[PDB]
Write an enzyme that holds these catalytic residues in place. Structure first.
Site, PDB file in Angstrom:
ATOM      1  N   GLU A 137      28.758  -3.878  -6.373  1.00  0.00           N
ATOM      2  CA  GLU A 137      29.832  -3.077  -5.797  1.00  0.00           C
ATOM      3  C   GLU A 137      29.342  -2.263  -4.610  1.00  0.00           C
ATOM      4  O   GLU A 137      30.080  -2.072  -3.639  1.00  0.00           O
ATOM      5  CB  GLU A 137      30.455  -2.172  -6.861  1.00  0.00           C
ATOM      6  CG  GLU A 137      31.248  -2.895  -7.956  1.00  0.00           C
ATOM      7  CD  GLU A 137      30.435  -3.866  -8.793  1.00  0.00           C
ATOM      8  OE1 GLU A 137      29.199  -3.926  -8.633  1.00  0.00           O
ATOM      9  OE2 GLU A 137      31.045  -4.582  -9.614  1.00  0.00           O
TER      10      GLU A 137
ATOM     11  N   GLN B  84       0.765  -1.237   0.000  1.00  0.00           N
ATOM     12  CA  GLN B  84       0.000   0.000   0.000  1.00  0.00           C
ATOM     13  C   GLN B  84       0.809   1.308   0.000  1.00  0.00           C
ATOM     14  O   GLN B  84       0.510   2.202  -0.800  1.00  0.00           O
ATOM     15  CB  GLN B  84      -0.967  -0.227   1.167  1.00  0.00           C
ATOM     16  CG  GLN B  84      -1.700   0.756   1.937  1.00  0.00           C
ATOM     17  CD  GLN B  84      -2.374   1.932   1.369  1.00  0.00           C
ATOM     18  OE1 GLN B  84      -3.267   1.766   0.485  1.00  0.00           O
ATOM     19  NE2 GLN B  84      -2.235   3.009   2.080  1.00  0.00           N
TER      20      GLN B  84
ATOM     21  N   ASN C 174       7.008  11.515  -3.469  1.00  0.00           N
ATOM     22  CA  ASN C 174       7.243  10.349  -4.295  1.00  0.00           C
ATOM     23  C   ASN C 174       8.125  10.694  -5.483  1.00  0.00           C
ATOM     24  O   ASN C 174       8.989   9.899  -5.861  1.00  0.00           O
ATOM     25  CB  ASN C 174       5.912   9.757  -4.753  1.00  0.00           C
ATOM     26  CG  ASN C 174       4.994   9.413  -3.599  1.00  0.00           C
ATOM     27  OD1 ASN C 174       3.923   9.994  -3.444  1.00  0.00           O
ATOM     28  ND2 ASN C 174       5.419   8.472  -2.771  1.00  0.00           N
TER      29      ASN C 174
ATOM     30  N   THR D 237       2.052   8.041  13.700  1.00  0.00           N
ATOM     31  CA  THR D 237       0.633   8.047  13.368  1.00  0.00           C
ATOM     32  C   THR D 237      -0.017   6.687  13.562  1.00  0.00           C
ATOM     33  O   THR D 237      -1.175   6.507  13.169  1.00  0.00           O
ATOM     34  CB  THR D 237       0.423   8.513  11.928  1.00  0.00           C
ATOM     35  OG1 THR D 237       0.987   7.552  11.028  1.00  0.00           O
ATOM     36  CG2 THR D 237       1.078   9.862  11.704  1.00  0.00           C
TER      37      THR D 237
ATOM     38  N   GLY E  86       0.564  -0.303   7.937  1.00  0.00           N
ATOM     39  CA  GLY E  86      -0.581  -1.009   8.476  1.00  0.00           C
ATOM     40  C   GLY E  86      -0.910  -2.270   7.700  1.00  0.00           C
ATOM     41  O   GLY E  86      -1.496  -3.207   8.251  1.00  0.00           O
ATOM     42  N   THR E  87      -0.563  -2.312   6.418  1.00  0.00           N
ATOM     43  CA  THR E  87      -0.306  -3.609   5.793  1.00  0.00           C
ATOM     44  C   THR E  87       1.169  -3.938   5.631  1.00  0.00           C
ATOM     45  O   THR E  87       1.607  -5.017   6.046  1.00  0.00           O
ATOM     46  CB  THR E  87      -0.977  -3.719   4.420  1.00  0.00           C
ATOM     47  OG1 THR E  87      -0.365  -2.809   3.495  1.00  0.00           O
ATOM     48  CG2 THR E  87      -2.455  -3.441   4.517  1.00  0.00           C
TER      49      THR E  87
ATOM     50  N   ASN F 113      10.189  11.114   6.722  1.00  0.00           N
ATOM     51  CA  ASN F 113       9.216  11.958   6.046  1.00  0.00           C
ATOM     52  C   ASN F 113       9.198  13.381   6.588  1.00  0.00           C
ATOM     53  O   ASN F 113       8.948  14.324   5.832  1.00  0.00           O
ATOM     54  CB  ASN F 113       7.835  11.318   6.157  1.00  0.00           C
ATOM     55  CG  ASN F 113       7.379  11.165   7.594  1.00  0.00           C
ATOM     56  OD1 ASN F 113       8.030  11.644   8.522  1.00  0.00           O
ATOM     57  ND2 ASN F 113       6.256  10.486   7.787  1.00  0.00           N
TER      58      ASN F 113
ATOM     59  N   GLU G  53      -5.660  -3.984   0.499  1.00  0.00           N
ATOM     60  CA  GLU G  53      -6.919  -3.244   0.484  1.00  0.00           C
ATOM     61  C   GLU G  53      -7.243  -2.954  -0.972  1.00  0.00           C
ATOM     62  O   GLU G  53      -6.455  -2.271  -1.654  1.00  0.00           O
ATOM     63  CB  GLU G  53      -6.866  -1.938   1.276  1.00  0.00           C
ATOM     64  CG  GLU G  53      -6.541  -2.101   2.733  1.00  0.00           C
ATOM     65  CD  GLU G  53      -5.073  -1.895   3.003  1.00  0.00           C
ATOM     66  OE1 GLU G  53      -4.259  -2.262   2.130  1.00  0.00           O
ATOM     67  OE2 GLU G  53      -4.739  -1.352   4.077  1.00  0.00           O
TER      68      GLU G  53
ATOM     69  N   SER H 271       7.031  -0.438   3.711  1.00  0.00           N
ATOM     70  CA  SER H 271       7.006   0.646   4.683  1.00  0.00           C
ATOM     71  C   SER H 271       7.051   0.067   6.088  1.00  0.00           C
ATOM     72  O   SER H 271       6.349  -0.906   6.384  1.00  0.00           O
ATOM     73  CB  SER H 271       5.761   1.514   4.505  1.00  0.00           C
ATOM     74  OG  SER H 271       4.584   0.768   4.738  1.00  0.00           O
TER      75      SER H 271
END
Ligand SMILES: Nc1nc2c(ncn2[C@@H]2O[C@H](COP(=O)(O)OP(=O)(O)OP(=O)(O)O)[C@@H](O)[C@H]2O)c(=O)[nH]1
Ligand SMILES: Nc1nc2c(ncn2[C@@H]2O[C@H](COP(=O)(O)OP(=O)(O)OP(=O)(O)O)[C@@H](O)[C@H]2O)c(=O)[nH]1
Ligand SMILES: Nc1nc2c(ncn2[C@@H]2O[C@H](COP(=O)(O)OP(=O)(O)OP(=O)(O)O)[C@@H](O)[C@H]2O)c(=O)[nH]1
Lengths: 91, 100, 427, 438, 427
Positions: free
Chosen positions: D254, D11, D228, D179, D144-145, D206, D71, D140
């Site tokens: 390398e 996700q 992104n 979060t 959360g997934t 972030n 999801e 990530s």
């Protein structure tokens, strides 16, 4: 709306209208005609506010057996046109 | 229908015949007021009343259920026409929440 | 896929479900006729969460409605969308409620449970996979509590792995009408704490305070009250439907939200309620949303948690934002009131961001908080219960039903247990 | 030949995969229909573009990537996007249920039924690929997934392929932001399940990604589009040598060999120096000395680890564009002469340099600049122990208060592993100061 | 070609066949005068399997109608389709019934068996290659049983190689109108069990249950009830006369259907019944067809199959289907309730699929199933039989007409044998 408005993405985890009415066929044509007539009827929906049957057939068309004295082919095509004429009760 | 003249409102009852295969409920519709046209996009209840109060000085203390100062310009009065007695005759078009 | 089947019980639940359903229909453009209104392919793309598909381009709701007196259902049916509800699903009762929780739990429920279970299991068979079920009712009134207890106590074992959301209206603190209301509330919450998983509490006095302090219209109805509470549910629910990067699962909010099994009860509250002139006298900025958002006056739940403390909060914002505004807002508020949070676990706000604002408004939000602010409420109910049980007032009806004071004893024990538990972690 | 297999697990992965492939189609001019303009490129797919695309006799480039999600919503939208008919239909594997932020839910109850399908996709690419140099896995940390499933995938793919390299790119916890209350849990879980098989994993913060935007790009309200785009051009810079030509070249192999001194610690930090807007670019001068000062300037690094809190240990710099080696070596001389950057005494020399002639690429209507000279820096330090020091002083509190543990035990998890994760982490910190001490 | 000759016996059989034949007529689209309007070449093709054809395009039916009292025949011939019958085919006797099986099987029959046999064998000469015959009558009805037992006994030997369908109605659990009815039923079943192969059993009590639950039309008429019952055998015959990747023969169903020589008893089962507004408010899909079909309420024959176990089930679907959905639904039910079935014969299901639906519905099903649910019927009849025999009340008529109690003895012995024999198979 939906571009490639002919098929939205094989394996659509989201669902589509016209699972009913006309389905039992694949994704592309079904979803595109779905959305097409779907939107069309919605728009309106939002309009104002105010010769030669072959032998050995089984199945009786009228008369037939009563008349006789010919071949299956000629007799049957004869009835093929006369079922527009006198025994016109066929449709 | 039964158009009231003391309220400017309308009521609808049903006259289904016997053996029609339908429920026993008669009063098909409420006795509110029929909007003149289709189902209005719900005008966000929270701003649907008649008057326009300005401020409330009450909760400062407690003598009555607070005060209601008025105004003099009545902004935000939004148009909602309603089916009155005028547009009535044998033979016309009336939309009833989508009922032609 | 994954979808929701709704439960509405009690006459309160009837009214609430009526308003909630009609607001959702307003969202997706459904008319009173029942056909679709194609304006938003995105509002079409996910109707499976709430509507089954019928033939002839019609969308029945998957709602189980139950009541006892025919007048309530006839009113609902005679509203704007009774035709959108189903007649078949209109199960009801042969007698009157009597506003007696023992009646509601043992006399007639014992022979309505069968039919209601059949209806709900037929709907479940129709559908594939469930998030779970949400039930809208009253914990104080007769019908809602009396059948809600039984229905949850049943559905739990046959569906042991779903979301059992309970959305209840909380009885008035000072004028609760029903005089057996203390008894009803106690005997209901006893099973509620053991069966449900997550609970929304609402009080009509706080509704009154909102409707006066900010609505500024002087003549609303319980209909308008229902509209605000339905706004709260719409905000919490539509996240499942629409695109955008944010947590949607009710289990997701739960695992973010509830630290311990007995933690259940939460406090809703909305984003701008705008007076007659402030629509054109107001500029919609993330800072001012947050300002009015985390406000004492703006809270609608029970009474100020100013006495209590915040364990956790969850915010779901809606519009064309970005990340850093919510980031800075939360960073600010943490230190603006550091002392009002529990030091056990930091980062105490769970945040979600949806891109599709409501139909007629650009930047909105919805709040929910788990704060140590229910002690006072069930403390008050405890004094009332003790005072009334002291001399067995109004006990004859329930004894004639066949009840016993023993259940009163363990019920008061359980409620006091919850009192002490919610005292302990916070203080 | 030369090629890599892309695994966007998460996700959050589809975010950055979508963006970076939006980049990847531009520099070879891949039309959103699938084929080139009047000019001829189609054949067996034999040019620089092969290392990502299979524009076989069908004439359509094949995205050598696999997108896994839990999801349906976001994957469904991205395929209702623009590059859909460029994508392959069942390279987009999506489930129907969520991990509920729970690493354990992602790991045990839900992970089993999908691994077969995902390995099926991987092997039916592996049959037609030749070089099998490496994977680009993107997940990530606070996913959360994306948190768990990626870890078990790494487990099985490491056990069934024991030779090839693994580069992980994962957005990190924030120092002051979490979060997800479950982030401080799944972080330790993923770390003590992945340290021992993940070949080289890289992270970034972030919050500082946000900060740089209005430090120099002057963006008060950036978004994901921007973020992104940044990370995409990061990976573009790193694979520039893989794709184009130049004077001298280096490879991910390398990078693996040079950068990681010891087992365990393989967590360097990355910075892209020449982030600046068009107005700055136009009438402001660009050259090697100032871009190198920008790269070693502490703040510009997108991770809140002051290098002065630590010591530089290893350094790799890739220069891309019209550059010559004279000023490059003179600049490294000035750098090494400066005293403030206190180097670990072990290696007198710590600089791997890679030069590509081909200038970088903007996207029209984008945010970066019509650049001529660019440098990407990836260097490994000791200034990062503070982050996991920060993680522990709160994980200890929350596990000691045993909050939320009912969730995990109910879904079916126990706590001996929760115990041993803390000793794994303590081992990594203690090894850090052990290697820091000379 | 293959054809079927209809037999109408008993005054119920009168009204039953009266509705059934006009059902066939309008499902083939013919006016009352008989001038068929070709609207579907396929139905024109297969109309032969029941009809013969004179000149003038009027479709004579091959049905022999027999009674004793003339008034009912006068009524049916005066009805909307009296012209469609043959006054040639009407035969009766001068005398009355007495609702007396003694007279029917010994006194009044001996002077009508001759003529009915003559007419039926004359039409047999008229026809070419029969599957067999079906008789519509009653088992508790007096004159129907009285003639039917004899006529079956007399056709069995002359045509020992065909299919003897019997269609009958069972006494009500609560009240059987006729009070010598249990004696009549026992005496009739004694010969039915030995002679027949296939028998459908229907009951007005569960018919009235259907009327209350789903007809929901307040005041019904027995003619519409006959419509409801006639749809069933029309459906089971539907495949005989239409194309599609399936099969039709009553034998092609019997071989699937009968597991042992002594089995003949079958409970009809019918598919979608549509309420007040469910026409617009239902979604017709194979899932919901399967769900509604295999239901405790939707069964209408004898008693709830909740109590025993199933032995064989056959279903025929009418519309535009495929094989996947029927197969998967069969697996769903089989695995869901694996226990209810009997483990003796696994794969105890049959499914036929015809393309041409009934008129007015685009998708229908018909269910027949022989289960261990018939116990209660012959139980009840047995205790009533013994109880009323305890003082041989209502016996002077029968002894006067000239039987003996030994026939009663053997009839009850055979019925007890059937009781024990099904019980032995089931447990
Ligand atoms: N419909 C409606 N309900 C209201 C209103 N105001 C409060 N309620 C709530 O509706 C509740 C009862 O709903 P039900 O559960 O359906 O009725 P009940 O179970 O019979 O309980 P009783 O109130 O004792 O009749 C009351 O407890 C009130 O708190 C209102 O204005 N309209
Ligand atoms: N990579 C990426 N991360 C984002 C983006 N927006 C926010 N984030 C961060 O990435 C993380 C997303 O991971 P999770 O929250 O666990 O997502 P998940 O388990 O897959 O489920 P979802 O929340 O529904 O997407 C969040 O913690 C954010 O901090 C984005 O566009 N791309
Ligand atoms: N035609 C008709 N028959 C009915 C009806 N209701 C019940 N029946 C039964 O169906 C049975 C069969 O009819 P017959 O065999 O012709 O009757 P019967 O032999 O003259 O003798 P009885 O049964 O005593 O009337 C009747 O006996 C009735 O008991 C009805 O509404 N119409």
């Amino acid at each position: 709306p939906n571009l490639i408005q002919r098929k939205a993405i094989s394996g659509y985890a989201g669902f589509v209208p016209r699972f009913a009415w006309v389905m039992g066929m694949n994704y592309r044509d079904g979803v595109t005609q779905a959305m097409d007539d779907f939107d069309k009827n919605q728009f309106v929906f939002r309009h104002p506010v105010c010769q030669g049957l072959i032998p050995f057939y089984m199945g009786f068309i009228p008369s037939m057996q009563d008349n006789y004295a010919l071949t299956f082919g000629n007799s049957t095509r004869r009835a093929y046109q006369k079922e527009l004429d006198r025994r016109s009760h066929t449709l | 229908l039964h158009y009231f003249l003391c309220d400017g409102t309308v009521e609808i009852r049903e006259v289904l015949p016997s053996n029609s295969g339908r429920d026993a409920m008669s009063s098909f519709l409420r006795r509110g007021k029929l909007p003149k046209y289709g189902p209005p996009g719900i005008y966000q209840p929270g701003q649907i009343t008649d008057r326009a109060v300005l401020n409330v000085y009450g909760g400062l203390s407690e003598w009555r259920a607070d005060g209601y100062l008025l105004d003099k310009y009545q902004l935000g009065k939004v148009e909602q026409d309603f089916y009155t007695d005028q547009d009535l005759s044998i033979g016309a078009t009336i939309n009833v929440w989508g009922r032609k | 896929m994954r979808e929701i089947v709704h439960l509405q019980a009690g006459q309160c639940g009837n009214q609430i479900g009526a308003k909630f359903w009609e607001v959702i229909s307003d969202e997706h453009g459904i008319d009173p006729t029942g056909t679709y209104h194609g304006d938003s392919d995105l509002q079409l793309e996910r109707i499976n969460v709430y509507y089954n598909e019928a033939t002839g381009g019609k969308y029945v709701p998957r709602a189980v409605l139950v009541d006892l007196e025919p007048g309530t259902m006839d009113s609902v049916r005679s509203g704007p969308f009774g035709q959108i509800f189903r007649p078949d699903n209109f199960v009801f009762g042969q007698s009157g409620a009597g506003n007696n929780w023992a009646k509601g739990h043992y006399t007639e429920g014992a022979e309505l449970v069968d039919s209601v279970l059949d209806v709900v299991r037929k709907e479940a068979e129709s559908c594939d996979c469930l998030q779970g079920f949400q039930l809208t009712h009253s914990l104080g009134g007769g019908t809602g509590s009396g059948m809600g207890t039984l229905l949850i106590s049943k559905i739990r074992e046959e569906y042991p792995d779903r979301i059992m959301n309970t959305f209840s209206v909380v009885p008035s603190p000072k004028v609760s009408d029903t005089v057996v209301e203390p008894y009803n509330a106690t005997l209901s919450v006893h099973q509620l704490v053991e069966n449900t998983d997550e609970t929304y509490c609402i009080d009509n006095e706080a509704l009154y305070d909102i409707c006066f302090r900010t609505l500024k219209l002087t003549t609303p109805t319980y209909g308008d009250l229902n509209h605000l509470v339905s706004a709260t549910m719409s905000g919490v629910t539509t996240c499942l439907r629409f695109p955008g990067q944010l947590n949607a699962d009710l289990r997701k909010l739960a695992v973010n939200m509830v630290p311990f099994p007995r933690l259940h009860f939460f406090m809703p509250g909305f984003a701008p309620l705008t007076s007659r002139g402030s629509q054109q006298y107001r500029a919609l900025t993330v800072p001012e949303l947050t300002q009015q958002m985390f406000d004492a006056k703006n809270m609608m739940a029970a009474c100020d948690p100013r006495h209590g403390r915040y364990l956790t909060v969850a915010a779901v914002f809606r519009g064309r934002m970005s990340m850093k505004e919510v980031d800075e807002q939360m960073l600010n508020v943490q230190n603006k009131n550091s002392s009002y949070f529990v030091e056990w676990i930091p980062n105490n706000v769970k945040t979600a961001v949806c891109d599709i604002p409501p139909r007629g408004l650009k930047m909105s939000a919805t709040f929910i908080g788990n704060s140590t602010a229910i002690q006072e409420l069930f403390k008050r109910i405890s004094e009332q219960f003790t005072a009334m049980f002291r001399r067995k007032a109004f006990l004859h009806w329930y004894t004639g039903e066949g009840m016993d004071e023993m259940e009163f004893t363990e019920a008061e024990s359980n409620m006091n247990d919850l009192v002490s538990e919610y005292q302990q972690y916070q203080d | 030949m030369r090629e890599c297999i892309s695994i966007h697990v998460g996700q959050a992965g589809v975010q950055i995969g979508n963006a970076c492939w939006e980049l990847y189609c531009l520099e070879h001019g891949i039309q959103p229909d699938g084929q080139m303009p009047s000019d001829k490129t189609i054949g067996g797919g034999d040019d620089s573009f092969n290392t990502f695309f299979s524009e076989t006799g069908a004439g359509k480039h094949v995205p050598r990537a696999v997108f896994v999600d839990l999801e349906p919503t976001v994957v469904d939208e991205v395929r209702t996007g623009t590059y859909r008919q460029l994508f392959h239909p069942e390279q987009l594997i999506t489930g129907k249920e969520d991990a509920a932020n729970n690493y354990a839910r992602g790991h045990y109850t839900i992970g089993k039924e999908i691994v077969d399908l995902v390995l099926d996709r991987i092997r039916k690419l592996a049959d037609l690929c030749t070089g099998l140099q490496g994977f680009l896995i993107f997940h990530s940390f606070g996913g959360g997934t994306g948190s768990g499933f990626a870890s078990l995938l790494m487990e099985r793919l490491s056990v069934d392929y024991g030779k090839k390299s693994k580069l992980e790119f994962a957005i990190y916890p924030a120092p002051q932001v979490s979060t997800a209350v479950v982030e401080p849990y799944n972080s330790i879980l993923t770390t003590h399940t992945t340290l021992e098989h993940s070949d080289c994993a890289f992270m970034v913060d972030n919050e500082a990604i946000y900060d740089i935007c209005r430090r120099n790009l002057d963006i008060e309200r950036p978004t994901y589009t921007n973020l992104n785009r940044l990370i995409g051009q990061i990976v573009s810079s790193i694979t520039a040598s893989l794709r184009f030509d130049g004077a001298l070249n280096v490879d991910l192999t390398e990078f693996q060999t040079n950068l990681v001194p010891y087992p365990r610690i393989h967590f360097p930090l990355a910075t892209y120096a020449p982030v600046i807007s068009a107005e700055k670019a136009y009438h402001e001068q660009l050259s090697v000395a100032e871009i190198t000062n920008a790269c070693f300037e502490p703040a510009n690094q997108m991770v809140k680890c002051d290098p002065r809190h630590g010591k530089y240990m290893a350094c790799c710099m890739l220069y891309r564009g019209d550059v010559v080696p004279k000023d490059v070596n003179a600049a490294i001389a000035t750098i090494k002469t400066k005293r403030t950057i206190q180097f670990v005494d072990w290696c007198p020399t710590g600089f791997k340099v890679g030069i590509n002639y081909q200038p970088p690429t903007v996207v029209p209507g984008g945010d970066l600049a019509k650049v001529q000279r660019a440098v990407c820096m990836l260097s490994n330090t000791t200034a990062i122990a503070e982050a996991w020091a920060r993680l522990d002083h709160k994980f200890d509190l929350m596990y000691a208060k045993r909050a939320f543990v009912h969730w995990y035990v109910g879904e079916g998890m126990e706590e001996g592993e929760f115990s041993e994760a803390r000793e794994d982490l303590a081992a990594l910190e203690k090894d850090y100061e052990e290697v820091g001490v000379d």
